[PDB]
Ligand binder design. Structure first.
Ligand SMILES: [Zn+2]
Ligand SMILES: [Zn+2]
Length: 59
């Protein structure tokens, strides 16, 4: 449950940002549209990867 599928390492508890279930490290949170740093309020994440909210702001 508590695992970052990006680096393959497991997550801590009070660090990793959760994208509704699927937990990823703060550093491992990289967009799938543009591919930059991301750590939002709402945060965008689809069932096709994890994105930056900035991508949808532009789009
Ligand atoms: Zn990670
Ligand atoms: Zn992006």
């Amino acid at each position: 449950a508590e695992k970052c599928s990006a680096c393959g390492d497991s997550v801590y508890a009070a660090e990793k940002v959760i994208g509704a279930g699927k937990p990823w490290h703060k550093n491992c949170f990289r967009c799938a549209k543009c591919g930059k740093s991301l750590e939002s309020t709402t945060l965008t994440e689809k069932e096709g990867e994890i994105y930056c909210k900035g991508c949808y702001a532009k789009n």
